[model samples]
Target chain A: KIYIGKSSLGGLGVFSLEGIKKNEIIEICPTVSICNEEIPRNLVDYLYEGNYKLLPLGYGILYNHSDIPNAYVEIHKINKVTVSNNVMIVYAYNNIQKDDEILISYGHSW
Target chain B: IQKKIYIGKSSLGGLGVFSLEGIKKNEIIEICPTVSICNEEIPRNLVDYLYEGKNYKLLPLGYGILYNHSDIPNAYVEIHKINTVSNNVMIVYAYNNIQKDDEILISYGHSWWK
Candidate 1:
């Protein structure tokens, strides 16, 4: 549903290979958890979940920041009696062009 | 040999194993076998042991036992038996695409949680 390419923002960014509709699910990512304090200062942009940091597998780490992003992320939890699973799904917030770069707010813009 | 993971201070509480590179979904992350420990007689206080059904326990090698727990974990454990006398091995698998530097996690079972 997406591809990794050069970003106009900085570094590498995720882009849609085809046009995406608003509210459409784009990426369903499984991420590893890291500690906040344990994370190197240079790699803090990927923080997710409270003190537990997120390292999303795949192109999840390649997303760039945008104050007004075209996409948003939804963290999901599937419960089990013995275990629970968490997954992050990125969805389009607005109609995105085929070649449009996919951007998400890092939740820093308060 | 290049190691796939490394031990680091964890945010979940103590130490954790972080991936060295991208891990594909359903990939076997590790094979935790007996390493200077026995499941038949393990201290309950020590949380490093992976539970093997039928009253057996497994001591994972390297950073195998260091993984923490999450309600929504990125990995899961599968137990494989070697023989009747030998200790079983617990294999960790990526539930999703695990990124580089991400801490590997597994469900410690429902009993571990309240």
Candidate 2:
């Protein structure tokens, strides 16, 4: 059971209510692409870019940034897409325990 | 109540939710849990509904965004304030008796959110 809650680092953050193992998949989120214009600076960090710049759904915007992240999005060609659909799969970079905040690498731009 | 529904193409727009069977009048349709996203952090996208609460916006998870708009909406959204991870959520219930294969409709009210 994973949910969104308060973060000690800053604002809203995703938390795992249960333990998760290393290299385990965290979640798969659907994304919809949007225009480049009118992107608020703060919102840019949450945007996912894979061919098309997408607004990742399902708490995708809530995962806060960490240089050393517990999780990260696996990016590659769309051969994976020919099977399923347009989506982003998040993998656990490290093992995590109950109530652990799910942090992902926002890549270094802050 | 746990109900049977499905996602399909909408003649109105992109995608929409459809009732699998008959749903009685005033009966609770579905309770969609949501997370609070600050207004500034949200982008204006999707054929979706965003319930604004003060400075933050409640974005529903799952197939919540798939429900489209109609002039004579068969369903309506009610906000339930609770004490949990899903602090408050939007509840979709029948405005009138709904028939099988009828699309689940909610009036977005002319571009309701910014």
Candidate 3:
């Protein structure tokens, strides 16, 4: 469970409501799949890997950028029977204090 | 009974949400929006597809995207920003009495029409 609020880092950011251990599973956010060939110029930041751009249905999209991020993202494939479906997992990169803003690198590749 | 609305070809342009039952004024048709996109991050092409919120765009998940636009719309959307970040909900309601078989319409704001 997490919450969103004002952040000193920038306009708005996602914050943990409770302390989290290093390597903890923070969020299992669901996503709406969009094809890479179909993704517009603006929504590129919302894309995940594998020729698929997704719009996460939760706070997954709200986390702000940090040069030194305390969290990281991973893409998972559920049972293969569910083709073309995937889940984005946000993991705590280090021990985090309550109310700490969850940050991740926007990646230099984009 | 059957569903009150369904997606069908619209006279306005593309597909639109059409009512199968009469709707009373101010009656909430449905609670919309399953996704929120920050305005600052939004691209120009997709901006017209979302409902404006405090500082973000509320993207309704289902039939929410099928409602057509009208200059004098019979329906309007109400947005509730759950917090400063991602959580929010859009409530679509009939602004006026709507008869069966009529298309539900919403004003996309003045900037869209003008």
Candidate 4:
């Protein structure tokens, strides 16, 4: 996992590269950590998923809760994570410029 | 509820949550209107809704046409719907803690806002 900072907001995961478009593919989320399970867990919950062993992408961890959001989330399929290619992409939904911190509604919170 | 209405600089702009003072997490910000006119329709003065700028022929949802165009931006607008609503709602969020009298800026581009 990439470590940008460690403070009250927690570790900021850098996208590593830059110049991502609005509807561009941010990353994929594994089935085990997609947060639709019987019991949803925190960002720490995805540490032990079966197939992909990485952090949960899609601003699910970066953003805090807000009734008013600057971004959104979408769930593509069910159990696709169990199969293969459980791909869900988080788009800009809004216009995002360079250096602006990317935000979204994580885990269908909105 | 602490409700404040901001007249956007132009057309498709301005959105956020209405809180009673303290904003909550994971709630809708606000849905913004798009700009533009369809080719074939009962013609009418749509510019009445616009503050500045002209309607275009894109983003069929029609909310992004009138937004003030800016090279740099301070915030982003997420266009989505809630509970199967027909109209497109643009939710605006702060890029950071904006001051009291700051202009709520949005990004303008065909594909991004599209």
Q: For model 1, name the residue pairs that clash.
A: A35-B11, A57-B99, A82-B109, A82-B110, A84-B71, A84-B72, A85-B72, A86-B72
Question: Which residue runs of candidate 2 sit more than 4 Å off their true CA positions?
Answer: A75-85, B1-64, B68-75, B78-114
Give one digit per residue, the lDDT tens place, for model 1 in B1-114. Answer: 123666566788655778889999998786554322244344344334545544345444334555787878999987776541134556788998999999898875757443
What lDDT score goes with residue B67 in model 3? Answer: 81
DockQ of 3: 0.05
Model 3: fraction of the reference interface contacts it also forms: 0.03
TM-score of each: 0.47, 0.59, 0.53, 0.29
* Top model number, DockQ: 2
Chain A only: TM-score per candidate = 0.85, 0.80, 0.86, 0.45
Q: Give the TM-score of candidate 1.
A: 0.47
**What is candidate 2's lDDT per residue for A1-110, written digit by digit as tens?**
46666799865688887898988888766665655764545456766666346656656666788887899886433332101235677788899899999999867674
lDDT of 4 by residue, B42-81 (tens): 1233222222212222121122222344566545566554
For candidate 4, lDDT tens digit of each residue in A1-110?
11122224343422323455656654433222322222222224322233233323322334333344444444455332211233344555555554445555434433
Clashes of each: 8, 0, 1, 16
Worst ten in a row by lDDT for model 1 chain B: B34-43
lDDT against the true structure, each candidate:
0.65, 0.69, 0.70, 0.36
True contacts kept of each: 0.00, 0.23, 0.03, 0.00
Interface C-alpha RMSD, model 3 = 9.7
Superposition error at B23 for model 4 (Å): 46
Weakest lDDT window of 10 consecutive positions for candidate 1 chain A: A78-87
State the displacement of the C-alpha of residue A93, model 3, in Å, after optimal TM-score superposition.
Answer: 0.4
